[model samples]
Target: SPELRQEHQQLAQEFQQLLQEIQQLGRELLKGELQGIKQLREASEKARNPEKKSVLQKILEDEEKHIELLETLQQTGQEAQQLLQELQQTGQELWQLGGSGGPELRQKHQQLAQKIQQLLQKHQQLGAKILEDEEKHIELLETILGGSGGDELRELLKGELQGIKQYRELQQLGQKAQQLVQKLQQTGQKLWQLG
Candidate 1:
């Protein structure tokens, strides 16, 4: 059906863009971390506050981990794209088969379901990392600045919140795909029964 194909293309494009957006966000995160480190160093140099120095050290360590986390996410994104291509191809095949069932239909839909589950896991992991780090960043900055929210912290919060929201949307999309797979499975079973 044109509707299914159109929906598939739209969702696929969204997922594709989501992966690219994550990469861009990762780079931005690195930039922000560096700037925060530089700003903290300058503050430490001018102030004799031990708490400031400690917070700076903690942030530096966390920021280092942030790079690793982003790398992991980008790698997962690569895997996701490959899986997405496979899913798209399988979806088209299934559409063409359209009530003409065979072992291939069952197998392809099974594979699609597995890939979607993997995607859901990846999205959850990435979302958790972003939220956790963002909260830490905000808290550390608040501590350093005597609880006064600075422009930097505010912007970081906004970006992180939006990132999380988008990730959840991606998750919901994945779930919809999973449900479709289930329907495919049911259709395959019926065809098998009739044949």
Candidate 2:
């Protein structure tokens, strides 16, 4: 019994850690999405160069997609949480010997693992999309500032400043995600305990 209790406790800790990781990722996602939007808004306002304007518009669209993806992730996070709760409850009912022998416990474990995998995939997909769009933004800004804009350089300069503003905001979102990860550690622990 003692060994089983210890095993369950350890598993609960792991569960809590996973939850924290998810939350951390979510916060980062939200931060990035919002900051990207802010930057695009600012850039769109002062933009003068035609090429830069077009690129910025596209960037804005990508930002919208990033935000939409984050919302989707949020929904998935809630679903994961719900599943975890159900798992916990079911686990409680089957807590005999850490529920190690229960068919339901096995099913829940498989489901939880799958959920985590999906969330990770979602994160990866969104992160990649954001990065690609950001690269385009930076490239356009460089061209405009590097004299490629020629006579339009002055006009592009106005948009450049706005782009910088958005870039920094994007960075901040990344920072927010880090904070969220730290907090979610406990959530993972709770789930492990229920096991």
Candidate 3:
């Protein structure tokens, strides 16, 4: 009976150790997803077709959300660790001060209660946050692809501005300053979305 009990005790400890490794793997996967999203965002610009651009960007947006979801999940667990920290700290402060103070212990106790309540309230708001994030993603896609890839749809006004001054090649090449204005504006718009 003692031998069986000993093996059972080791069984649970091994299980806990297994969980520790799993948690480590989950964190590594989180960072891997983040890196993938970064590369997708980078490639987003070079995709010129309205279909390719919009679809690529939509994937990028969704990828961003997925990673956010992962990070939130990670933080939610870490958040419990913090909650435990607060509990321990508050308890320690109260216990230490009881040798020292009734009022300060009361302060520590009340502070702990307040913090726990705040964290609970935050989790309660998580439902609202998730709902809004869904709608926000929709609106972002709508805004970016509005009326078909937005200004990027019929993107180039450069040809018209380039004009048929082909015979006047010398000035036309030198006259690139004309495009400089449009190019600057386009650059800012790209930066706006990129930002």
Candidate 4:
């Protein structure tokens, strides 16, 4: 149990830091786009070769797309964080209101339990869709950007993989929670001794 607690604490800290870094990366993406656009403009003005102009334009387009993607992801991250905070507040309120030691307390617990199940279902669906879209965009960037975009795309690849792994972990956690809910229902039935 102590080991589990320590692992959870470490994960929590990693999650917090990752969110902050994601926000920072989003900002950097904006700056990267801006610099790229400036480069395109400068190259267009001074380019003696058409190939160089085409290269600059390609870089500009690639950066703009990445900026758009990062902005969308940042918005999603913020929304999910807000939802998590709200859920935490609700959990605290429910815990304080009912200590989970009686019949009526059990009823409230069941209601909260159902609410959590619905929330997780909706949240997981939305998260899965977002991850899918982000992965597609990352792959598209890799294909289009080729030389210079390769490194930036690789960075995004890491984030996308992390999301995929996290989604699977969340799925497992959700399944376990559902299993416990069923167990709780059975125990409650036995407690009341009702057919």
Q: What is the TM-score of candidate 2?
A: 0.59
Cα lDDT listed for each candidate:
0.59, 0.57, 0.44, 0.49
> Candidate 1: which pairs clash?
none
Measure candidate 1: CA RMSD.
5.3
lDDT tens digits by residue: candidate 1, 52-81: 567656665665676676667667656766
Q: Which structure among the candidates has the greatest lDDT?
A: 1
What's the true lDDT of residue 30 in model 3?
Answer: 60
lDDT of 2 by residue, 1-195 (tens): 455555555655565565666556667657755755675677766678687778767767766776777677567666656766765675565555554664666566556655654654555455555556656766765665664544444444455455445544544543443343333334434544565
Ranking according to TM-score, highest score first? 1, 2, 4, 3
Preferred candidate (TM-score higher): 3 or 4: 4
Stretches of candidate 1 off by over 4 Å are 1-14, 17-20, 27-48, 147-195
TM-score of each: 0.62, 0.59, 0.38, 0.43
What TM-score does structure 1 among the candidates reach? 0.62
lDDT of 4: 0.49
**Model 4 misses residue 30 by how many Å?**
1.8
Q: What is the C-alpha RMSD of each candidate to the true structure, in Å?
A: 5.3, 7.2, 24.3, 9.1
Runs in model 2 with CA error above 4 Å? Answer: 1-8, 28-32, 35-39, 97-102, 147-195
